[PDB]
A paper describes a structure:
In that regard, HcKCR1 is of particular interest as a highly efficient tool for optical neuronal silencing. In addition, the membrane-facing outer surface of the HcKCR1 trimer is decorated with nine sterol lipids and nine phospholipids, which we modeled as DOPE molecules, although in some cases the density did not clearly exclude choline headgroups and different hydrocarbon chains. Although Asp116 is conserved in HcKCR1 and HcCCR, its mutagenetic neutralization in HcKCR1 results in conversion of the K+-selective channel into a Na+-selective one with a much smaller conductance. In the HcKCR1 structure, the presence of Ile73 and Leu69 on the helical interface between TM2 and 3 moves TM2 away by 1.4 Å (measured at the Cα atom of Val66). In HcKCR1 Tyr222 forms H-bonds to Trp102 and Gln218. As a result, the extracellular channel opening is interrupted with the bulky aromatic Tyr side chain in HcKCR1 but continues deeper into the molecule in HcCCR, creating a key determinant for K+ selectivity. In HcKCR1, the Y222W mutation caused a stronger Vrev shift to more depolarized values indicating a decrease in PK/PNa than that caused by the W102Y mutation, which suggests that the residue in the position 222 is more important for K+ selectivity than that in the position 102. When the channel opens under illumination, Tyr222 (likely assisted by Phe221 and His225 on the other side of the putative conduction cation pathway) allows K+ passage but functions as a barrier to the flux of larger hydrated cations like Na+ and divalent cations.
Kalium channelrhodopsin 1 from Hyphochytrium catenoides (HcKCR1) is a light-gated channel used for optogenetic silencing of mammalian neurons. Together with structure-guided mutagenesis, we show that K+ versus Na+ selectivity is determined at two distinct sites on the putative ion conduction pathway: in a patch of critical residues in the intracellular segment (Leu69/Phe69, Ile73/Ser73 and Asp116) and within a cluster of aromatic residues in the extracellular segment (primarily, Trp102 and Tyr222).
Author numbering:
A (entry chain A), B (entry chain A), C (entry chain A): 17 to 256
Write the structure that this text describes.
């Protein structure tokens, strides 16, 4: 049974489309404006190709929420629906989201992290579309990819966390709060959603993920953008 | 209503399969034959991995037209149809097509261009399969990704256009004619097709795109191949 | 007609899931344990990102066999089925499998090989789902991508085969046995399967591919892992 207030859901996706997409434009605008807090046009005249990955993720997520809003405003399951198959839209975004984080701190094993998150979400896509007791077999399989990934990421994050200056360490701390505080919120919501326990309705499931996407991609991207400016402002602008 | 002359459409796709695929084989054959117009086997003994991207695109496009011809010769919607979902086959080709162009001129923001064209086509895939007034919402969303992408590409193209010698500038000019003259022809055909205004029938839509693919991938790849030979013939063969 | 012993098929996939996935964990564990047979933590403190590709392939394949086992244990076609569309799961694995092999021997034209195997499998996906005489048109199209790919790979393999020391040449020989002895076994099984000649039943088709995947990904990955240790033990551990 899925008979929910679509105009409300479409409005929320439309509002999130503007902010997430608009947030991405600022990141790209701010990236190609100066090496750090100054207006230095880099040594080579352009930023490295990976620094723009944070901005593109929000634009990619913002575009998806534009399509989600069209799906809800239509009033049901559109033929090109980005809401019917849960977590399918996140397959194209989360692997890049961890990849952007990995490049920012030059964490090791970027390829391992990419497939860790790439396969974590595909287990979510399979779990959602499975109307049987094996829904949680995929969920358990997905967690087997996430738990080693989360724990290993914490270990490497702390390795890089104590080497940054305190001024630049402030932004990394809040990036970790979003990464290690909200990413594990998606599996928790899956357990309690209508798929699992049943406490959270389908409509409330969409709204909560709308705000989670505002946090994990838009706000997280802003912190990465601000972190990157400070990181380059201490090394390549001050020589330290 | 889709009851069109499939043997004609299959023949056209079959003919385009041979030329596009055959054109790709020449590019690969010509690439691994000499640094420029001579038979110099490069300094490292092999061409860089990206120079072969132009040839692979035609082979990838040629393979797709082999599958399209099988779909039409079958006489309708084959289970593995590359014609039922319009613009879906272009999702795997156009992003590489811009990527090959970006590497040829070492344009900045290659990652931004890739996702600009990657998301431009996905809006086309959604627009086609949407039997409602929101077809043009996806179309408008797709154009929001294409118009900044086209205009920005023109700005960077002209930046690199005035630094090449006139001999090598001739080939770049015609590459721009195809890129800035025919890529915007796809959205124009969408408006006038049976999806939009209704002037162009579905059958004529397939035929026109068959010739557009001959131009944007096969002929465009040839110009890139000839451009690349001249570009390397002026710098690494003459020292200028 | 597909009414086969699913508990047997689920058990085989479950057993292959444990070994293939478990084999991948050893590769990753062994990779990040020493430059060669010693415990040298590399010069830069971490292995290159591509050395871990062999381990990830088995984990990716092992995860897929976890999903295949869930599909069979369910007792038919699960909504998220990795068995309904034959060769679709191999699209994400084989291109990386050749890519891992190409990086191990630093073979040229890695991009050409990737699309050669990527498009070879997509022809298999189309061939399987085509209930007409054009099934073998896709099969023939797929072989047109595989035969040049196989023959070219043999030529480049032998080029790199005579330059390695005999101690390290032993492992390369068996890698070639799997690559040039079992990869062409998949098209042969397609001809004789229920899709083609009809000698091999659908159930026996799953079991044989279960053992082929144990060989082409798990055992092949082990040989690559052992080969890589020896290759680095002769150059960067002995200076030769
Ligand atoms: C736009 C920017 C996007 C950027 C990145 C995109 C990448 C992600 C790709 C998204 C894939 C979209 C698939 C969504 C399928 C939705 C199916 C659906 O809605 O089904 C339910 C719905 C039933 O609902 P009603 O009939 O209203 O029931 C009430 C009774 N009156 O069924 C339908 O409408 C039938 C669906 C028609 C066919 C679906 C076509 C999907 C579009 C195909 C293009 C996508 C290509 C995917 C690649 C593999 C090829 C399948
Ligand atoms: C070969 C080289 C290709 C290289 C790169 C390929 C990448 C692009 C992938 C292409 C995806 C292909 C999807 C096409 C689906 C076509 C559906 C279709 O034709 O439906 C219409 C047709 C109705 O027509 P008729 O019955 O003739 O009506 C007249 C009444 N007598 O419906 C059918 O035939 C039923 C369709 C059967 C199921 C479709 C199976 C599609 C193949 C699956 C493999 C693709 C995997 C995609 C990944 C996501 C998983 C879905
Ligand atoms: C888990 C780790 C995986 C890692 C990597 C994954 C990448 C590969 C992606 C795999 C795509 C999976 C597609 C499988 C579709 C299977 C369709 C199927 O089983 O149909 C047959 C079956 C008929 O059988 P029964 O009714 O039992 O008949 C007997 C009568 N009692 O039909 C059904 O069950 C209906 C199918 C429901 C819809 C299918 C939904 C597929 C899941 C969608 C997510 C995948 C996204 C793909 C991207 C493009 C969007 C389509
Ligand atoms: C079926 C679902 C599949 C969805 C999975 C999504 C996973 C996304 C896959 C990869 C995302 C792309 C990011 C890859 C890393 C970017 C390359 C990198 O690290 O930089 C190397 C280097 C950076 O330059 P430097 O050496 O600093 O230059 C200094 C000048 N002397 O590269 C360059 O030179 C620039 C060119 C890099 C490649 C251009 C971008 C191509 C990326 C491919 C995107 C693939 C996306 C697949 C689908 C997306 C769906 C969301
Ligand atoms: C769901 C729909 C998804 C479809 C989206 C399609 C987007 C395509 C994604 C990426 C396409 C691949 C091109 C990426 C750029 C290639 C790498 C590059 O720029 O070169 C770096 C560098 C080049 O060498 P140099 O440093 O010059 O060596 C000198 C020797 N001392 O790399 C190398 O060393 C060679 C190895 C490069 C990687 C090999 C190719 C792997 C590419 C992955 C393809 C991904 C395709 C995804 C699906 C395709 C569908 C059409
Ligand atoms: C629709 C079906 C599509 C499925 C097709 C599957 C094809 C898979 C596409 C690409 C697979 C990823 C492998 C690409 C090659 C990896 C990059 C590489 O060669 O290394 C370059 C270089 C290695 O470092 P060095 O320069 O040695 O550093 C020394 C320190 N001074 O790169 C790095 O620095 C590390 C970062 C590399 C990128 C991180 C990984 C991102 C890869 C994208 C994966 C895309 C997968 C797409 C879907 C997968 C489905 C199975
Ligand atoms: C619990 C309430 C949640 C509210 C939601 C948040 C909404 C967005 C607001 C920003 C959230 C993230 C901010 C992270 C912290 C950075 C702010 C900051 O101060 O940054 C500066 C500089 O960096 C910045 O400018 C970052 C802030 C810019 C954020 C811009 C907002 C996002 C862009 C959206 C525009 C388009 C949206 C469309 C309208 C919305 C319609 C619904 C860094 O230096 P300071 O510590 O000030 O030191 C001063 C000396 N250097
Ligand atoms: C409006 C009419 C459109 C006609 C369609 C076009 C069909 C293909 C013909 C070529 C079109 C693109 C040519 C672009 C310009 C390059 C031609 C050229 O002259 O190139 C040379 C050299 O480069 C070349 O050789 C490029 C031309 C080679 C093109 C080969 C054709 C494509 C391969 C197809 C073979 C297989 C097709 C199967 C048969 C078809 C069955 C239907 C560059 O130097 P020049 O200016 O001559 O200076 C001389 C001193 N250096
Ligand atoms: C026809 C029978 C087929 C049997 C199936 C094979 C099962 C797996 C057994 C290994 C097969 C591949 C082995 C390849 C050859 C390497 C073995 C070897 O000797 O390696 C050493 C060292 O390298 C190794 O250790 C490689 C072997 C390690 C393989 C570990 C097995 C795979 C991991 C699976 C664990 C988890 C599985 C879960 C349980 C299964 C439940 C069903 C290299 O040096 P040597 O020539 O011994 O010289 C000695 C002085 N240097
Ligand atoms: C309450 C919700 C939102 C967040 C729950 C997770 C919080 C408590 C987690 C997420 C990120 C974590 C931080 C990540 C990194 C470090 C650096 C280390 O050297 C000290 C601990 C410290 C500072 C962690 C403290 C705990 C932390 C803040
Ligand atoms: C009529 C159709 C096919 C093409 C329409 C677009 C044509 C007119 C466009 C496409 C590419 C464009 C060229 C692209 C780059 C340059 C370099 C610049 O320094 C002068 C203008 C010039 C030379 C442009 C002239 C206009 C041009 C030729
Ligand atoms: C293109 C070049 C490299 C040859 C590779 C394709 C060859 C091996 C393919 C092309 C067409 C194929 C044949 C087409 C149809 C059938 C009917 C089937 O009931 C049995 C197999 C059989 C007889 C196939 C065997 C393999 C075959 C001959
Ligand atoms: C019987 C099945 C399993 C395998 C059939 C293919 C076998 C015979 C093939 C696969 C790999 C091949 C080897 C690959 C590379 C070389 C190096 C070359 O300098 C001499 C031949 C030699 C040693 C080949 C001999 C034949 C070989 C072993
Ligand atoms: C912007 C969205 C982000 C960063 C989403 C992240 C989502 C996850 C890490 C989801 C993980 C899941 C599991 C751990 C197991 C079950 C399936 C999921 C998808 C809910
Ligand atoms: C070989 C084929 C090529 C280069 C195709 C390019 C296609 C486009 C740039 C299509 C663009 C579209 C829009 C701008 C908006 C609406 C949807 C499209 C797909 C028609
Ligand atoms: C682990 C699995 C591997 C390495 C599988 C490899 C499969 C192939 C090389 C399959 C090739 C095919 C053809 C040559 C043509 C017809 C279709 C295939 C898929 C059976
Ligand atoms: Na995390
Ligand atoms: Na353009
Ligand atoms: Na092979």
């Amino acid at each position: 049974i899925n008979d929910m207030d679509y105009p409300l859901l479409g409005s929320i996706c439309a509002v999130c489309c503007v902010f997430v997409a608009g947030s991405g434009i600022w990141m790209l605008y701010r990236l190609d404006l100066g090496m750090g807090y100054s207006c230095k046009p880099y040594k080579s005249g352009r930023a490295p190709e990976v620094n723009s990955l944070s901005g593109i993720i929000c634009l990619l997520c913002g575009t998806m929420y534009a399509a989600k809003s069209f799906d809800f405003f239509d009033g049901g399951g559109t033929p090109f629906s980005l809401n019917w198959y849960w977590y399918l839209d996140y397959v194209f975004t989360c692997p890049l989201l961890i990849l952007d984080f990995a490049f920012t701190l030059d964490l090791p094993h970027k390829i391992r992290y990419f497939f860790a998150v790439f396969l974590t979400l595909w287990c979510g896509v399979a779990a959602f579309v499975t109307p049987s007791a094996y829904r949680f077999a995929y969920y358990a399989l997905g967690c087997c990819w996430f738990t080693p990934f989360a724990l290993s990421l914490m270990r490497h994050v702390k390795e890089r966390y104590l080497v940054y200056p305190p001024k630049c360490q402030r932004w990394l701390f809040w990036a970790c709060v979003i990464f290690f505080g909200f990413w594990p919120m998606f599996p928790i919501l899956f357990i309690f959603s209508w798929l699992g326990t049943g406490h959270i309705s389908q409509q409330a499931f969409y709204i909560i993920h709308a705000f989670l996407d505002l946090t994990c991609k838009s706000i997280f991207g802003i912190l990465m953008t601000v972190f990157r400016l400070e990181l380059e402002e201490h090394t390549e602008v001050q020589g330290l």
